[PDB]
Structure 1
Amino acid sequence: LKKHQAKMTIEREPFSETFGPKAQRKRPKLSFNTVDELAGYSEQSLDSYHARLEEKKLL
């Protein structure tokens, strides 16, 4: 499934319909569905970002 996901996404939504002068994309693709999930997602994302920064600084 991973080896075909990219061509699947391009066949579903071509590049010219996503961004550009003729783009028709209005709804984004989100990893969350509620505001509470968004708050938890932002917290976890900030924690992971700081962890990767600390790992890069240690390296």
Structure 2
Amino acid sequence: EPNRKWFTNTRVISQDTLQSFREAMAEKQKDPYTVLLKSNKLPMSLIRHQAKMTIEREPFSETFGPKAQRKRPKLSFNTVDELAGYSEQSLDSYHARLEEKKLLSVATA
């Protein structure tokens, strides 16, 4: 049956009350030996993109392919000296990781 109360807000709360409730409830979660009383009647519902940006700025078609317009690579170095340092530390990290994996006929099931 049509009724006016279908199109009204059913639960409302103010800014300061919501903030105080959240702060007090967070302080209650800080203690694991303190539990609520009548938790079923409490408003617990109130308590409880880099990839997208890169794809938006540069599409896959403009990156690589027959219609690609990409011409300038994205680098982590600026001049030749930091390029040499980057290569040196990259080789050192690669060798260290390989030694770590080495330290860490098929096998039986």
TM-score, normalised by the number of residues in structure 1:
0.94
Runs of 5+ unmatched residues, structure 2? 1-45, 105-109
Structure 1 residues 49 and 18: CA distance shift in structure 2, 3 A: same
Give the 3 Å change call, closer, same or farther, for CA 2–18 of structure 1 in structure 2.
farther
CA RMSD of aligned residues (A): 5.0
Structure 2 CA distance for partners of 1:4 and 1:41, relative to 1, 3 Å? same
* C-alpha deviation, 1:2, in angstroms: 24
- Point out where structure 1 has 5 or more consecutive residues left out of the alignment: none
Higher relative contact order (CA 8 A, sep 6+): 1
Instruction: Count how many residue pairs are aligned between Structure 1 and Structure 2.
Output: 59
SS in 2 for 1:50: helix
Which has the larger share of strand?
2
The CA deviation at 1:17 is: 0.2
Give distance in 2, aligned partners of 1:5 and 1:41. 24
TM-score by length of 2: 0.51
Q: Deviations over 1:1-59 (max 9, x none)?
A: 99910001000100000000000000000000000000000000000000000000000
Q: Secondary structure at the match of 1:24?
A: coil
Distance 1:8 1:50, change over 3 A: same
